[PDB]
Design a protein around this motif. Structure first.
Motif: not given
Ligand SMILES: CCCCCCCCCCCCO[C@@H]1O[C@H](CO)[C@@H](O[C@H]2O[C@H](CO)[C@@H](O)[C@H](O)[C@H]2O)[C@H](O)[C@H]1O
Ligand SMILES: CCCCCCCCCCCCO[C@@H]1O[C@H](CO)[C@@H](O[C@H]2O[C@H](CO)[C@@H](O)[C@H](O)[C@H]2O)[C@H](O)[C@H]1O
Ligand SMILES: CCCCCCCCCCCCO[C@@H]1O[C@H](CO)[C@@H](O[C@H]2O[C@H](CO)[C@@H](O)[C@H](O)[C@H]2O)[C@H](O)[C@H]1O
Ligand SMILES: CCCCCCCCCCCCO[C@@H]1O[C@H](CO)[C@@H](O[C@H]2O[C@H](CO)[C@@H](O)[C@H](O)[C@H]2O)[C@H](O)[C@H]1O
Ligand SMILES: CCCCCCCCCCCCO[C@@H]1O[C@H](CO)[C@@H](O[C@H]2O[C@H](CO)[C@@H](O)[C@H](O)[C@H]2O)[C@H](O)[C@H]1O
Lengths: 310, 310, 310, 310, 310
Positions: D265-273, D276-278, D283-285
């Motif tokens: 979950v934590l890693g996914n939140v980091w990916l989602r932000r 989110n911030h450009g 994020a995909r890499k």
């Protein structure tokens, strides 16, 4: 002339109160003093002035001497009475002291759950003389009967303890003595505030607060979930009671939660179709009343329940 | 002169501690040494210097000789005592050695769950002399009483074991002897760390981490779910205790979780309407404080609970 | 000539009716009057005209005098009969009065749950004479048998109570007497209205009201959830019954809920693909019939269940 | 000289192994051969050369002859021993053969669940001589002791069975004989593979497969649900054990599942932000590594658990 | 010459079949006819030609006359046998008729759940002669043994009932008689169709119907939910069985549901990424096969399970 049998019943523990089976279990002791002059003896030179017997040896002695004992029965006992001591002390003039220490379950047929959990219940133990009152007349042993200091019961609080003597006609045409030890108990409500009241209040209020989003679909989703949870509460709470033929106050409160939740959903569907067919501004204006009426229903219904039951 | 009855109680197993019923069950053994000179015999030529009896034969012998035995009762026993051995050894000078091996449940009326699960409880067994102290005076058998090496209890750890002698007036005006074997036990906390503490902490923290999305609706949804789960934890945990009339530390912690979750939802609704009516930048600026205050509440409330109970 | 044994059975409590195990438990009392002239005695000068015995002493006396007692068995008793009193009164002409007070569980093999919960069940106790009818012939004791005033049963209501005498051939070629005490009971339906009927009705109706959104996906989601909840209700309700080899009315109603929910989902998928492949107006026109047919199915199916079972 | 008491214990059934209460129940039989020459008799002309007794009649005979019997106790018995046969055969030279058939529960204080469910447990029955070894010395009856062919236990498999003789000092200063019958058992693992292992593996793997969507919010939702389900598994599994003071292998595995889910979950939140911030491409890499590291954690942690416990 | 002991066992009730504990409980009656000429008497002038005894008085008489009784044991009894009647009738030529009416639980070690719920199980009661066959030889009492008309068992149907005589060597080198009463029972399948089969089928089919939406994410969500529900079914169903070391047919079916659901999710993720990276038309074309293969898997797997187990 009928013989006097003095009776004392002492409750030392309440091992449990089973409201689903409508019974209660106790550890207690029975004391009987009964002067039978036919039992008088004289001790030998420098010999014991009181004779100690097991119940079995004493009953064999009584049968050998053809003496009728004051046979009794715990009228509302159910199941097996686990005896600890059944002791006899026989004094020189024929006074029999009997000690019976036991554990047993007893019926509680006066359970009335209509006001549950604000109910005060009546618990009693009946001790019945099998033989009629022209043979034996039960009296009250003084300074023994009642309830103890460490009953070990956490949910219930004893409010009144009483003893008296009445009659029954179970096995004889004539009246037979009945000794009654009764007490009244009420509940501690902390369990119901913490585990039932406050969770339901939190769910209802958290729903109301989430109603300020102004997203009707969210209201419908949340209300459906709340109804499901309230039905889980219904099943849980009902599990602890018997399958009563009448409605409890708790049942009324839970039915109220069901209905209020359903009305919430219905109003939200009406608002969502109002916003769907072009009436967004009318929808919002009436949403004002939806908000200002969600808690009025709960307060009004709570007052209605109080009026009905109390 | 009163006769001396030396008493030893040995607890060999703790078969169970039932905190909901507030009782505990043990396998133990009772030893009684009692010199009654009236029981003195002389063995025949080359004949046994010690006589072995069942309890039943010995009591019949005592009744035939009109000798009062030191009758006793386990005062806080509840239910059926399952006896294994009830043996008598009678020596030539009249010393009766009695062995009683049993399994029985006992009341635990000193249970206080206020600090649960950091509570230390008192467990005792009372052995009461039925006859008054001018007939029999209980003494302490030396080198027998206490607790065993394999008690078989996994959650509880015995911290102190004690014996002493006191009085009671259950059935006589005069004082009667009471033997007490008591011990104190505390819990192993591993179960509560693994099954209660860590799951709740993980749920709370995983929620906080998901709060960094910046999607207020997700916060509200997740918080509602968390509140539901915390109420499931409330019902589960409360199932294992009695329906107490007072608040436990665990109850305080669970009420804190309820309230903090609800406040989270409320703050998120306020943020979502702030973003709804044009204040998106103010909404984000205050979201900073929402994040920086979610865990302050939990730390502060935990300190408050510690201050209250400890 | 065969001896007459007058039999009375009195049920004082119904401690429980276990429909899953198909048994019921009672507290009751058995009365037997049996004139055996061989037992006639004469009291001594100013000596008791009635002799009181324990069951054990009386049976030893009968064996010593080589008198056969009317041995009996509770034919449908299961488990342990917990006896309270087993008393004998023997009058001067040889009339034996026997009192047996007991708690016991009894088989209920006439349970038929086909109409559950609108079922009326038959409960009986068989008392069988072991010896054949040319030795002992059971009669009916007058004014004793029946059911009491405080049965303590909350879900069931006794509708008819009956006694009679029949025969059996369990252990002898010749016929042996059988005493039967039977009663019929029906249920109070309040529990099923509150905990089963009204929740299911609320779920179904709240679904119908939410069908006015006009969002087919919401219908499918909600219907899937409703099906899950109905299957939870199936498991809960079935838990309380035995694993019957036939279908109960409740089973029929629950299968109806399953099927109607599935058909709802199917119709919604068809509507959603109709709106997907361009037929939005046809989709809405047929949505009219979807709405106007959701409750027709439930009413029609309820009538079908009534027709089938009643 | 001390008398020899030959002892045989035969376990015929394992009616149950209760790992939560840490006990096991068996149906077994005890055989004792004990030559007491004082019991020697001579049969009458053409009269039985072996005498058959109930335990009660034999003990009364022993008391009348003032003969001490080898009194014994099942040291780790808990609760009520339900006896089936207690039979005595006495031969002409005074050899007493005793048969005791029973059902009883026994303590299992050697339960160690650290490797559960790959644990091998020790089960024993202690038979203790109450009297010291200068009176009676237990021997081993040959060809009787052990375990039977139909133990009726499905989860456990007996791996080793053993008997031997030791001493105890429970009630005497001198040593007293102790007979031990012990056996070792391990579990069948099929239950844990089917009901525990495979469901958890399926949930974890189905989550990983759903991680290939590339929708971070879906990952967070699914992971939260998975954490909830894993905590349900924690509560279920812990229900079957006692409240242990130490960590089981199963506890370690469940804590691993909790932590890995939270880190997901934590890693996914980091990916989602990050998205989110450009930083969508970054994020995909990094999502590449998220995928390529989800199962590395589980394999590595499983190896770590194996290293720790084994 | 060995004495003939005719044995009849009659099962009147099946109070329960416990497949988790692998036992069954019955109410039944045992009849023994045994001619012992040493017991022959002559009635007094006009005195009873048959003597009635309690079991206790008869055994005391046998011990006084030094007559060995045919001692027996219910070899697979477990727990306490609750006796109702233990009666003796002794005729003038020395024929002892014994009636033993009881309730008891018995081991069922032949339970094989591999085909559950299509399994036919073997239930038996062993009655073992303790003494060897050169003393007593069990015969079959004619016209008594078997099963009754009201067994009270709802899930099971008795298919075959049988009696015969064999040997055992439990306590003697020589062979001892064994009486066996066995019966075979199969299940009524209605419970499994209604509560297990039809719910699972409805869930699977409702999922398939919802697959016609053409929204891959909905498929993944729904399939994850279905997998969760199937695992709940796994835990529920497994609760009713023992922790078997082998796979049941029901286990195979549930593992199939797990795997098919997971494969559904995987295929949907592949379709969703196919539509994600530009291949929407290829995605739809292959969705055709996804639909046309969802039910082929279930039919094929059901045939595979049938092939394996049957
Ligand atoms: C060194 C001094 C030694 C001197 C003697 C010591 C004490 C004397 C022992 C008195 C106990 C009587 O002995 C035995 O006690 C138990 C309960 O206690 C009784 O109780 C037993 O039968 C009754 C029957 O209703 C049941 O309630 C009970 O569940 C069961 O355990 C026995 O029927 C009685 O025979
Ligand atoms: C080859 C050597 C043979 C020599 C003799 C061998 C051992 C002697 C047997 C002594 C056992 C006494 O015999 C019997 O034991 C059981 C428990 O053990 C007692 O216990 C029984 O009644 C008491 C009543 O309170 C209950 O607690 C108990 O649940 C019940 O099983 C019996 O009341 C006693 O009559
Ligand atoms: C001051 C007056 C004193 C005078 C005498 C007072 C009352 C006389 C006591 C009569 C009770 C008979 O004594 C005892 O009672 C209990 C139940 O009550 C009986 O019951 C016991 O054995 C039977 C056996 O089937 C079981 O059903 C029962 O569970 C068990 O507790 C005992 O077998 C009987 O021995
Ligand atoms: C036609 C042939 C007839 C010849 C005789 C037939 C068989 C002889 C009967 C022997 C049985 C002994 O009689 C009785 O049996 C039961 C168990 O079986 C014993 O058991 C009973 O008391 C003990 C006390 O600890 C308990 O363990 C047990 O739960 C209880 O049922 C009784 O104490 C015994 O008195
Ligand atoms: C007006 C006519 C009156 C004439 C006599 C009437 C009937 C005669 C009574 C016979 C019953 C025998 O008396 C008593 O019954 C119960 C069960 O019934 C027996 O059973 C008791 O001990 C055995 C021991 O194994 C247990 O199985 C049983 O759980 C327990 O209740 C008692 O051991 C027996 O002593």
């Amino acid at each position: 002339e009928p013989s006097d049998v003095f009776i004392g019943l002492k409750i030392d523990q309440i091992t449990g109160i089973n409201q689903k089976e409508e019974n209660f279990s106790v550890v207690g002791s029975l004391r009987i003093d009964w002067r039978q002059p036919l039992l008088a003896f004289e001790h030998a030179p420098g010999e014991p002035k009181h004779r100690t017997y097991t119940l079995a040896t004493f009953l064999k002695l009584l049968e050998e001497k053809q003496i009728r004992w004051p046979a009794f029965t715990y009228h509302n006992q159910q199941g097996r009475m686990d005896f600890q001591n059944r002791l006899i002390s026989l004094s020189e003039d024929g006074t029999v002291m009997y000690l019976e220490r036991f554990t047993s379950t007893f019926q509680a047929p006066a359970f009335d759950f209509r006001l549950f959990p604000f109910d005060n219940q009546l618990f009693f133990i009946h001790v019945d003389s099998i033989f009629p009152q022209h043979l034996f007349r039960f009296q009250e042993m003084q300074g023994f009967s009642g309830l103890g200091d460490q009953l070990g019961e956490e949910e219930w609080i004893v409010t009144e303890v009483n003893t008296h003597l009445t009659t029954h006609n179970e096995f004889t045409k004539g009246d037979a003595s009945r000794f009654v030890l009764e007490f009244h108990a009420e509940r501690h409500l902390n369990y119901y505030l913490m585990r039932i009241l406050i969770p339901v209040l939190l769910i209802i209020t958290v729903s109301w607060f989430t109603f300020f989003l102004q997203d009707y679909t969210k209201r419908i989703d949340l209300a459906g979930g709340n109804l499901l949870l309230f039905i889980a509460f219904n099943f849980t709470i009902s599990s602890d009671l018997p399958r009563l033929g009448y409605i409890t106050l708790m049942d009324a409160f839970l039915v109220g939660t069901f209905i209020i939740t359903a009305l919430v959903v219905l109003g939200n569907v009406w608002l969502r179709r109002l916003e769907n067919h072009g009436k967004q501004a009318l929808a919002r204006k009436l949403d004002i009343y939806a908000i200002t009426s969600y808690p009025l229903a709960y307060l009004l219904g709570a007052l209605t329940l109080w009026l009905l039951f109390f």
